[PDB]
């Protein structure tokens, strides 16, 4: 009975928006970094805003951990706290350096990959 369907749902809708958050440091010539924060403007350095473990369902990463925009960027959502068909599957949404788009892959079991992903 476990929320296999949802939980692969929730876990993208907690990196899906991160996109965004991603774009606009980069259009403006800063980097990212991971976790919660103040914009660096030393370093010119923008946090994600998200905490590691805001959904308890898995954790959010960042890599590189900072990105500048010129290396292939990954936001993954690690299912750690999923029930059995989930846990110790990886959602990752990876941004193309030499293009600027972005596509999500999943390693879950092909019936539970969300909507707008692939293996």
């Known amino acids: 009975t476990e929320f296999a369907r949802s939980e692969g749902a929730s876990a993208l809708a907690s990196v899906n928006p991160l996109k965004t958050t991603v774009e606009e ?7 990212v970094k991971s976790g919660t924060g103040t914009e660096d403007a030393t370093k010119k350095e923008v946090p994600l ?3 590691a473990d805001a959904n308890k369902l898995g954790t959010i990463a960042l890599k590189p951990d900072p990105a500048d925009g010129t290396a292939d960027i990954t936001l993954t959502f690690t299912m750690g706290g999923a029930g059995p068909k989930n846990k110790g599957k990886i959602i990752t949404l990876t941004r193309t350096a030499a293009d600027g788009l972005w596509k999500c892959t999943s390693d ?6 969300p909507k707008g992903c692939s293996r």
């Open 25 to 31: 440091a980069l259009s403006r010539g800063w980097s």
């Open 49 to 51: 805003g998200v905490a």
């Open 108 to 113: 879950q079991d092909e019936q539970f990959i």
